[PDB]
Amino acid sequence: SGRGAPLAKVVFRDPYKYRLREEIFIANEGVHTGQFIYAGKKASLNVGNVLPLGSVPEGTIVSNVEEKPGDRGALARASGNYVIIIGHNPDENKTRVRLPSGAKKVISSDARGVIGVIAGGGRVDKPLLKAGRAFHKYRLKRNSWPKTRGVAMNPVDHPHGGGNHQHIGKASTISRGAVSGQKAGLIAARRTGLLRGSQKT
């Protein structure tokens, strides 16, 4: 509930006492029931396996990458999202990766990850026709819907409120030194307007 991507319950075997230990994963596409999942430093390069980032070639596509070795998953956990692997730095024990947002990072080679692309992709390309379908979406997320506009309020409630017309009256762009109660609008905006051109990332 509340999570776009499906989960997968993989059950490993306790290596120090006689019992089973079930773990909750986030499924990657193609992972079906009954599949064997191998996790370690010497696992194969197949979809569903957990390998360190330094044990895969360039161009590998991974998911649920931990940003320090042992966090248990940080970086690609939404639906349809993945992480690309650009290069290796043997002399510093680091690996360069591309994140969903388009940013580059350097993280330890011992950081783990799962191979593939998170399941349940294409979710946000089907419209929500009705206010009812947004009502039930956030009913299992949290209390953030409906949203009232600041400019439809009185000045006692929001910085934007008030006036014989609905208008702001001051620039919507707000400084990063602003205090609580002032940050409403575009906080620390580097630009504004319709985005024309190349991203220039």
Binding site: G30, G34, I61
Partner: protein, 91 residues
Amino acid sequence: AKRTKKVGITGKYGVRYGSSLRRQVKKLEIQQHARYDCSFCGKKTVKRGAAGIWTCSCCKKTVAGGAYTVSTAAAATVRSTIRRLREMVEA
């Protein structure tokens, strides 16, 4: 007989919601209520449960996949790539 000429499944939504948004929804609903192949047993009995969960009644097997189809174009590319890298690096 052909009951609707172009509204098809989306006819339930009435005159509501504009034509562009009803064409868009029609494309994906037809994908999520179809039946696919269970490659493990050849039968065409793969339906959708929740989003991303594809179930077949014959085997009681479930396969993770897209929100509206079994396989997306992005996953397939990764599948072929991994076959190439694995079959290229094991040398």
